[PDB]
Amino acid sequence: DNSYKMDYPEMGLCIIINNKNWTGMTSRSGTDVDAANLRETFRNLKYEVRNKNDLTREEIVELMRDVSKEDHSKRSSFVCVLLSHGEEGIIFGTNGPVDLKKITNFFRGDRCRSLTGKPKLFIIQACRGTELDCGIEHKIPVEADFLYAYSTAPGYYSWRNSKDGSWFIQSLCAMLKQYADKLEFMHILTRVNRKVATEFESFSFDATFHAKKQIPCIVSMLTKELYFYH
Amino acid sequence: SDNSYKMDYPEMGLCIIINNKNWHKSTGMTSRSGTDVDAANLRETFRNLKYEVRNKNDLTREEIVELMRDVSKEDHSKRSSFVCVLLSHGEEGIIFGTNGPVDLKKITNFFRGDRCRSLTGKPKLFIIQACRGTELDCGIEHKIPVEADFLYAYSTAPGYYSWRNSKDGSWFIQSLCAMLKQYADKLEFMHILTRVNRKVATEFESFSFDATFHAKKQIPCIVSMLTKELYFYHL
Amino acid sequence: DEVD
Amino acid sequence: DEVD
């Protein structure tokens, strides 16, 4: 009971929400590269992937509600990837903001019983504010067994390249491919942290957005170690 | 003729413990019985990990700010890491001096990779025993970023109370010191903190004569901007 | 048991 | 490079 049990018949769902076109907000160029990379990556990890594009804030909430009421009994885990605009604690539907808490609340240990005790992973590529990093040089709690992999630090922008995709998802998929059969998830996410921190730097004609840096933010309320192999 | 932080500098580093127990009466806030048990446990735990421990008690909001600016002004060049343990009242994003609030961000900003140069690239650990709100868990069944190489080990989830026992000390610090003692010579720090999560989640449940506060649960919250693995034993 |  |  040091590692989560990952030998259920199915690894679980991987829900990818890919919001690209919008309100009045920028179209998120490169996000389809991200959504394809994740689909492939989690396909190899033996997740049943569901891709959904351009969802309104109502559709996001209704989708998450329905998925939380499925029977996950034969599934090891749950993964949700959110690709969109955002602010601290908030992600955007195509027609406005949704509170992250509202989404994740559906999977609470008391509200989604078939996932109680199983790791629930939320991967969020979205801004968390508008700061730039200029760089240098016998019960269980209902909030337990969640892991939030944020692309950026609280308060900060998150960077996305229009042809390569976002820095975080790029690095995330690469580290999963190289290390999912070798390393525990946190240690994979720490390598993601390093890759984004060291190998990426913004290039912009605008001085104010040029040569900026990014560090992702791992938030773990997991109670066991998580391995994708077995 | 590098996935781990270099921990063989001549010193492991400073461990600053801020232990706030007694509040100025005008704040309207009450005392934090059990917190001295936490601070002594912490002192002994980090002593065995070879940190130079400095305990500070009952600091005002201005004393907390001054202390952290001063400590960030030290030369850390021969130290591997930096640890700051905050034991106090708080709410989301805020810890309390004995006479009012301090933003956690103002504290941790002194140690940004561009503001504290002798700690650039080195692990900066902030351990926070404090409420982050008033929710109760009822349970069931070339360059580097300036925000890199911080780890925040919060006692409780965002928005929630954190629990403290008046004679045993807080659930989180209790569990933290026990897991450090048993596993610091064996596991990477994230995995140690994961054991802390499970210990708090499974082994503690509140007992109160007040039905509102009875039989409640806690899960700690690990927040990591670390870029490498952290081990307390080396070679 | 008390809250912080 | 763009921000989200």
Coordinates of C-alpha atoms in Angstrom, one line a residue:
Chain A
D1 CA 0.0 0.0 0.0
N2 CA 2.9 2.3 -0.9
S3 CA 1.8 2.4 -4.6
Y4 CA -1.6 2.9 -6.1
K5 CA -3.1 -0.3 -7.4
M6 CA -2.9 0.1 -11.2
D7 CA -3.7 -3.4 -12.3
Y8 CA -7.5 -3.0 -12.7
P9 CA -8.8 -4.2 -16.1
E10 CA -8.5 -0.6 -17.4
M11 CA -6.1 2.2 -16.7
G12 CA -9.0 4.6 -16.8
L13 CA -10.3 7.5 -18.9
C14 CA -8.2 10.4 -20.2
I15 CA -10.5 13.3 -21.0
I16 CA -8.9 16.1 -23.1
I17 CA -10.7 19.4 -23.4
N18 CA -9.1 21.4 -26.1
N19 CA -10.4 25.0 -26.4
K20 CA -8.9 26.9 -29.4
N21 CA -11.5 29.2 -30.9
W22 CA -13.6 31.7 -28.9
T23 CA -15.9 36.9 -25.4
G24 CA -13.1 38.1 -27.8
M25 CA -10.1 36.1 -26.9
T26 CA -7.1 34.9 -28.9
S27 CA -7.4 31.7 -30.8
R28 CA -4.9 29.3 -29.1
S29 CA -2.6 28.5 -32.0
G30 CA -0.6 25.3 -31.5
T31 CA -3.1 23.8 -29.1
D32 CA -4.2 21.1 -31.6
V33 CA -0.5 20.0 -31.7
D34 CA -0.9 19.6 -27.9
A35 CA -4.2 17.7 -28.0
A36 CA -2.7 15.3 -30.6
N37 CA 0.5 14.7 -28.6
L38 CA -1.5 14.0 -25.4
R39 CA -3.9 11.6 -27.3
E40 CA -0.9 9.6 -28.6
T41 CA 1.0 9.8 -25.3
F42 CA -1.9 8.6 -23.1
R43 CA -2.9 6.0 -25.8
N44 CA 0.5 4.4 -25.2
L45 CA -0.1 4.5 -21.5
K46 CA -3.3 2.4 -22.2
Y47 CA -5.8 5.1 -21.3
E48 CA -9.1 5.3 -23.1
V49 CA -8.8 8.9 -24.5
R50 CA -11.7 11.2 -25.2
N51 CA -10.9 14.4 -27.0
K52 CA -13.5 17.2 -26.9
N53 CA -12.9 20.5 -28.7
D54 CA -14.3 24.1 -28.2
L55 CA -16.6 23.6 -25.3
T56 CA -18.8 26.3 -23.7
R57 CA -18.6 26.7 -19.9
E58 CA -21.9 24.8 -19.6
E59 CA -20.6 22.0 -21.8
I60 CA -17.4 21.7 -19.7
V61 CA -19.5 21.4 -16.5
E62 CA -22.0 19.0 -18.0
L63 CA -19.3 16.8 -19.5
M64 CA -17.4 16.5 -16.2
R65 CA -20.7 15.7 -14.3
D66 CA -21.6 12.9 -16.7
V67 CA -18.1 11.4 -16.5
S68 CA -18.2 11.5 -12.7
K69 CA -21.4 9.5 -12.8
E70 CA -20.0 6.7 -15.0
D71 CA -19.0 3.5 -13.2
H72 CA -15.2 3.6 -12.8
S73 CA -15.0 0.4 -10.8
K74 CA -12.9 -1.5 -13.3
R75 CA -10.6 1.5 -13.9
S76 CA -7.3 2.2 -12.0
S77 CA -7.4 6.0 -12.3
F78 CA -8.8 9.1 -13.9
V79 CA -7.1 11.8 -16.0
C80 CA -8.4 15.1 -17.2
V81 CA -6.5 17.5 -19.4
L82 CA -7.6 21.1 -19.7
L83 CA -6.2 23.2 -22.5
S84 CA -7.5 26.7 -22.6
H85 CA -7.2 30.3 -21.4
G86 CA -7.4 30.9 -17.7
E87 CA -6.8 33.0 -14.6
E88 CA -5.9 32.0 -11.1
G89 CA -8.3 29.1 -10.2
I90 CA -10.2 29.5 -13.4
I91 CA -10.3 28.0 -16.9
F92 CA -12.3 29.3 -19.8
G93 CA -15.1 27.8 -21.7
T94 CA -15.6 29.2 -25.2
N95 CA -18.1 31.6 -23.8
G96 CA -16.7 32.5 -20.3
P97 CA -14.8 31.4 -17.2
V98 CA -15.4 28.3 -15.0
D99 CA -14.0 27.8 -11.5
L100 CA -11.6 24.9 -11.4
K101 CA -13.1 23.8 -8.1
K102 CA -16.5 23.4 -9.7
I103 CA -15.0 20.9 -12.2
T104 CA -12.8 19.0 -9.7
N105 CA -15.6 18.9 -7.1
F106 CA -17.4 16.2 -9.1
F107 CA -14.7 13.7 -8.4
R108 CA -14.5 14.2 -4.6
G109 CA -14.1 11.0 -2.7
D110 CA -17.7 11.3 -1.5
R111 CA -19.3 12.3 -4.8
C112 CA -17.7 9.8 -7.1
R113 CA -17.6 6.6 -5.2
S114 CA -16.2 4.4 -7.9
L115 CA -13.0 6.6 -7.9
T116 CA -12.6 6.7 -4.1
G117 CA -9.0 5.8 -3.2
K118 CA -7.9 6.0 -6.8
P119 CA -5.7 8.8 -8.2
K120 CA -7.5 11.6 -10.0
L121 CA -5.1 13.6 -12.2
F122 CA -5.8 17.1 -13.6
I123 CA -3.4 18.5 -16.1
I124 CA -4.0 22.2 -16.8
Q125 CA -2.4 24.2 -19.5
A126 CA -3.8 27.6 -18.9
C127 CA -2.6 31.0 -17.6
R128 CA -3.0 31.6 -13.8
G129 CA -2.6 35.3 -13.9
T130 CA -0.6 38.0 -15.8
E131 CA 2.8 38.1 -14.2
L132 CA 5.9 37.4 -16.3
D133 CA 9.0 35.5 -15.0
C134 CA 12.1 37.4 -16.2
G135 CA 14.5 34.7 -15.0
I136 CA 18.0 34.9 -13.7
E137 CA 21.6 34.2 -14.9
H138 CA -11.9 4.7 9.0
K139 CA -12.5 7.6 6.6
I140 CA -10.4 9.3 4.0
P141 CA -10.6 13.0 3.3
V142 CA -12.7 13.9 0.3
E143 CA -9.9 16.0 -1.2
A144 CA -7.3 13.2 -1.0
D145 CA -5.9 11.4 -4.1
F146 CA -6.0 14.4 -6.4
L147 CA -3.0 15.6 -8.3
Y148 CA -3.0 18.9 -10.1
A149 CA -0.3 19.4 -12.7
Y150 CA -0.3 23.1 -13.4
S151 CA 1.7 24.4 -16.5
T152 CA 2.8 27.5 -14.6
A153 CA 3.2 29.1 -11.1
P154 CA 0.3 30.8 -9.3
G155 CA -0.2 34.4 -10.7
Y156 CA 1.8 33.8 -13.9
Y157 CA 1.2 33.5 -17.6
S158 CA 1.7 30.2 -19.3
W159 CA 3.5 30.0 -22.6
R160 CA 2.4 28.3 -25.8
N161 CA 4.3 28.1 -29.1
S162 CA 2.1 28.5 -32.2
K163 CA 3.8 25.7 -34.2
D164 CA 5.3 23.5 -31.5
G165 CA 2.4 23.7 -29.0
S166 CA 2.6 24.7 -25.3
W167 CA 6.0 24.4 -23.4
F168 CA 4.4 22.4 -20.7
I169 CA 2.5 19.8 -22.8
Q170 CA 5.5 19.5 -25.1
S171 CA 7.7 18.6 -22.1
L172 CA 5.1 16.6 -20.4
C173 CA 4.5 14.2 -23.4
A174 CA 8.3 13.9 -24.0
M175 CA 9.0 13.0 -20.4
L176 CA 6.1 10.5 -20.3
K177 CA 7.4 8.8 -23.4
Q178 CA 10.9 8.6 -22.1
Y179 CA 10.2 7.7 -18.5
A180 CA 6.7 6.3 -17.9
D181 CA 8.1 2.7 -17.7
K182 CA 11.0 3.8 -15.4
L183 CA 9.9 6.5 -12.9
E184 CA 7.2 7.3 -10.4
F185 CA 4.9 10.1 -11.6
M186 CA 6.1 12.9 -9.3
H187 CA 9.6 12.3 -10.4
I188 CA 8.4 12.4 -14.1
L189 CA 6.7 15.7 -13.3
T190 CA 9.9 17.0 -11.7
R191 CA 11.8 16.3 -15.0
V192 CA 9.0 18.2 -16.8
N193 CA 9.7 21.0 -14.4
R194 CA 13.4 21.0 -15.3
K195 CA 12.8 20.7 -19.1
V196 CA 10.4 23.7 -19.1
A197 CA 12.7 25.7 -16.8
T198 CA 15.9 25.1 -18.6
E199 CA 15.2 24.5 -22.3
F200 CA 12.6 27.2 -23.0
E201 CA 12.8 30.9 -23.2
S202 CA 10.3 33.2 -24.8
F203 CA 11.2 35.0 -28.0
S204 CA 9.2 38.1 -28.9
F205 CA 9.5 41.3 -31.0
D206 CA 7.8 43.0 -28.0
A207 CA 10.5 43.7 -25.4
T208 CA 8.0 43.2 -22.6
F209 CA 7.3 39.6 -23.5
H210 CA 10.8 38.7 -24.6
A211 CA 13.3 36.3 -22.8
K212 CA 10.8 35.3 -20.2
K213 CA 10.8 31.9 -18.4
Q214 CA 8.4 29.4 -17.0
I215 CA 8.2 27.0 -14.1
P216 CA 5.3 24.5 -13.9
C217 CA 3.6 23.8 -10.5
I218 CA 2.9 20.4 -9.1
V219 CA 0.1 20.2 -6.6
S220 CA -0.2 16.8 -4.9
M221 CA -2.7 15.6 -2.5
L222 CA -1.9 12.0 -3.5
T223 CA -1.5 9.4 -0.7
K224 CA 0.6 6.9 -2.6
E225 CA 3.1 6.6 -5.4
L226 CA 1.9 6.3 -8.9
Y227 CA 3.5 4.1 -11.6
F228 CA 2.2 3.7 -15.1
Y229 CA 3.9 0.3 -15.7
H230 CA 3.4 -3.0 -13.8
Chain B
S1 CA 35.8 10.5 -17.7
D2 CA 22.4 15.1 -12.8
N3 CA 18.8 14.6 -11.7
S4 CA 19.4 15.3 -8.0
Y5 CA 20.2 18.6 -6.3
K6 CA 23.8 18.9 -5.1
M7 CA 23.5 18.3 -1.4
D8 CA 27.2 18.0 -0.5
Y9 CA 28.0 21.7 0.1
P10 CA 29.8 22.0 3.4
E11 CA 26.5 22.8 5.1
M12 CA 23.0 21.5 4.5
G13 CA 21.7 25.0 5.3
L14 CA 19.5 27.0 7.6
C15 CA 16.2 25.8 9.0
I16 CA 14.3 28.8 10.3
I17 CA 11.3 27.9 12.5
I18 CA 8.8 30.6 13.3
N19 CA 6.7 29.5 16.3
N20 CA 3.7 31.7 17.0
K21 CA 1.7 30.7 20.0
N22 CA 0.4 33.8 21.9
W23 CA -1.5 36.5 20.2
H24 CA -1.9 40.2 21.0
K25 CA -5.3 40.4 22.6
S26 CA -6.4 43.3 20.4
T27 CA -6.4 41.0 17.4
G28 CA -9.2 38.9 18.9
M29 CA -7.2 35.7 18.1
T30 CA -6.6 32.8 20.4
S31 CA -3.5 30.9 21.4
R32 CA -2.2 27.8 19.7
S33 CA -1.7 25.1 22.4
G34 CA 0.5 22.3 21.2
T35 CA 2.7 24.4 18.9
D36 CA 5.7 24.2 21.2
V37 CA 5.6 20.4 20.9
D38 CA 5.7 20.9 17.1
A39 CA 8.7 23.3 17.3
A40 CA 10.8 21.0 19.5
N41 CA 10.0 18.0 17.3
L42 CA 11.0 20.1 14.3
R43 CA 14.2 21.3 16.0
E44 CA 15.3 17.7 16.7
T45 CA 14.3 16.4 13.3
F46 CA 16.2 18.9 11.3
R47 CA 19.2 18.7 13.6
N48 CA 19.6 15.0 12.7
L49 CA 19.3 16.1 9.0
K50 CA 22.3 18.4 9.8
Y51 CA 20.5 21.7 9.4
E52 CA 21.5 24.7 11.5
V53 CA 18.2 25.3 13.2
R54 CA 17.1 28.8 14.5
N55 CA 13.8 28.8 16.5
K56 CA 11.9 32.1 16.8
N57 CA 8.9 32.5 19.0
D58 CA 5.9 34.9 19.0
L59 CA 6.9 37.3 16.2
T60 CA 4.9 40.3 15.1
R61 CA 4.1 40.8 11.4
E62 CA 7.0 43.3 11.1
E63 CA 9.4 41.0 12.9
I64 CA 8.6 38.2 10.5
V65 CA 9.2 40.4 7.5
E66 CA 12.5 41.8 9.0
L67 CA 13.7 38.3 9.9
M68 CA 13.2 36.9 6.4
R69 CA 14.7 39.9 4.6
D70 CA 17.8 39.6 6.9
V71 CA 18.1 35.8 6.4
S72 CA 17.8 36.2 2.7
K73 CA 20.6 38.8 2.9
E74 CA 23.0 36.2 4.4
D75 CA 25.6 34.5 2.3
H76 CA 24.3 31.0 1.6
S77 CA 27.2 30.1 -0.7
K78 CA 28.4 27.1 1.4
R79 CA 24.9 25.8 2.1
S80 CA 23.0 23.2 0.0
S81 CA 19.5 24.3 0.8
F82 CA 17.1 26.6 2.7
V83 CA 14.2 25.6 5.0
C84 CA 11.6 27.8 6.6
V85 CA 8.9 26.4 8.9
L86 CA 5.9 28.6 9.6
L87 CA 3.7 27.6 12.6
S88 CA 0.8 30.0 13.0
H89 CA -2.7 31.1 12.3
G90 CA -3.4 31.9 8.7
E91 CA -5.9 31.9 5.8
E92 CA -5.4 31.3 2.1
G93 CA -2.1 33.0 1.1
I94 CA -1.6 34.5 4.5
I95 CA 0.2 33.7 7.7
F96 CA -0.3 35.8 10.9
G97 CA 2.2 37.6 13.0
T98 CA 1.0 38.1 16.6
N99 CA -0.4 41.5 15.7
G100 CA -1.7 40.9 12.1
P101 CA -1.3 39.1 8.7
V102 CA 1.7 38.7 6.4
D103 CA 1.3 37.7 2.8
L104 CA 3.1 34.4 2.2
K105 CA 4.2 35.8 -1.1
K106 CA 6.0 38.7 0.5
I107 CA 8.0 36.3 2.7
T108 CA 8.9 33.9 -0.1
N109 CA 9.8 36.7 -2.6
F110 CA 12.9 37.5 -0.6
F111 CA 14.3 34.2 -1.7
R112 CA 13.5 34.5 -5.4
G113 CA 16.3 33.2 -7.7
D114 CA 17.1 36.8 -8.7
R115 CA 16.9 38.3 -5.2
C116 CA 18.9 35.8 -3.1
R117 CA 21.8 34.9 -5.4
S118 CA 23.6 32.5 -3.1
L119 CA 20.5 30.3 -3.1
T120 CA 19.9 30.4 -7.0
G121 CA 19.5 26.8 -8.2
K122 CA 19.2 25.5 -4.7
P123 CA 16.1 24.0 -3.1
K124 CA 14.1 26.4 -1.0
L125 CA 11.6 24.6 1.3
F126 CA 8.7 26.3 3.0
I127 CA 6.7 24.2 5.5
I128 CA 3.5 25.8 6.5
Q129 CA 1.3 24.7 9.5
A130 CA -1.6 27.2 9.3
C131 CA -5.3 27.3 8.2
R132 CA -5.9 28.2 4.5
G133 CA -9.6 28.9 5.1
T134 CA -12.6 27.7 7.1
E135 CA -13.7 24.7 5.1
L136 CA -14.0 21.4 7.0
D137 CA -13.4 18.0 5.4
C138 CA -16.1 15.6 6.4
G139 CA -14.4 12.7 4.7
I140 CA -16.0 9.4 3.5
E141 CA -16.1 5.6 3.7
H142 CA 21.2 30.1 -19.8
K143 CA 18.6 31.4 -17.4
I144 CA 16.3 29.7 -14.9
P145 CA 12.9 30.9 -13.8
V146 CA 13.0 33.0 -10.5
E147 CA 10.1 31.0 -9.1
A148 CA 12.0 27.7 -9.7
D149 CA 13.4 25.4 -6.9
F150 CA 10.7 26.3 -4.3
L151 CA 8.8 23.6 -2.5
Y152 CA 5.8 24.5 -0.4
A153 CA 4.6 21.8 2.0
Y154 CA 1.2 23.0 3.2
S155 CA -0.4 21.2 6.1
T156 CA -3.9 21.4 4.5
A157 CA -5.7 21.7 1.2
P158 CA -6.5 25.2 -0.3
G159 CA -9.5 26.7 1.5
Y160 CA -9.4 24.4 4.5
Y161 CA -8.8 24.5 8.3
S162 CA -5.6 22.7 9.5
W163 CA -5.8 20.7 12.7
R164 CA -3.7 20.9 15.8
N165 CA -3.9 18.7 18.9
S166 CA -3.2 20.7 22.1
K167 CA -1.0 18.0 23.7
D168 CA 0.5 16.1 20.7
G169 CA 0.9 19.1 18.4
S170 CA -0.4 19.5 14.8
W171 CA -1.3 16.5 12.7
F172 CA 0.9 17.5 9.9
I173 CA 4.1 18.4 11.8
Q174 CA 3.7 15.2 13.9
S175 CA 3.5 13.2 10.8
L176 CA 6.2 15.2 9.0
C177 CA 8.8 14.6 11.7
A178 CA 7.9 10.9 12.0
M179 CA 8.2 10.3 8.3
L180 CA 11.5 12.3 8.1
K181 CA 12.9 10.3 10.9
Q182 CA 11.9 6.9 9.5
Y183 CA 12.6 7.6 5.8
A184 CA 15.1 10.5 5.2
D185 CA 17.9 8.0 4.8
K186 CA 15.8 6.0 2.3
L187 CA 13.4 8.1 0.1
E188 CA 13.4 11.1 -2.1
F189 CA 11.7 14.1 -0.4
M190 CA 8.5 14.1 -2.6
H191 CA 7.9 10.4 -1.7
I192 CA 8.5 11.2 2.0
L193 CA 5.9 14.0 1.7
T194 CA 3.6 11.5 0.0
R195 CA 3.9 9.2 3.1
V196 CA 3.1 12.3 5.2
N197 CA -0.1 12.8 3.1
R198 CA -1.2 9.2 3.7
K199 CA -0.4 9.3 7.4
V200 CA -2.4 12.5 8.0
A201 CA -5.2 11.3 5.7
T202 CA -5.6 7.9 7.3
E203 CA -4.5 8.1 10.9
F204 CA -6.1 11.4 12.1
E205 CA -9.7 12.3 12.7
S206 CA -11.0 15.1 14.8
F207 CA -12.7 14.6 18.2
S208 CA -14.9 17.5 19.4
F209 CA -17.8 18.1 21.8
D210 CA -19.0 20.5 19.1
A211 CA -20.8 18.6 16.3
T212 CA -19.7 21.1 13.7
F213 CA -16.0 20.3 14.3
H214 CA -16.3 16.6 15.1
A215 CA -15.0 13.6 13.0
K216 CA -13.3 15.8 10.4
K217 CA -10.4 14.9 8.2
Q218 CA -7.3 16.5 6.7
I219 CA -5.2 16.1 3.6
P220 CA -1.9 18.1 3.3
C221 CA -1.0 19.8 0.0
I222 CA 2.4 19.5 -1.6
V223 CA 3.3 22.3 -4.0
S224 CA 6.5 21.8 -6.0
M225 CA 8.4 24.0 -8.3
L226 CA 11.5 21.8 -7.8
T227 CA 13.6 21.0 -10.8
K228 CA 15.5 18.0 -9.4
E229 CA 15.1 15.2 -6.8
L230 CA 15.9 16.0 -3.2
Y231 CA 17.8 13.5 -1.0
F232 CA 19.0 14.1 2.5
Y233 CA 21.7 11.4 2.5
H234 CA 24.4 11.5 -0.2
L235 CA 26.7 9.7 -2.6
Chain C
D1 CA -8.1 18.9 18.7
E2 CA -8.4 22.7 17.6
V3 CA -8.2 24.5 14.2
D4 CA -5.3 26.9 13.3
Chain D
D1 CA 5.7 32.3 -28.6
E2 CA 2.3 33.4 -27.2
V3 CA 0.7 33.4 -23.6
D4 CA -2.6 31.6 -22.7

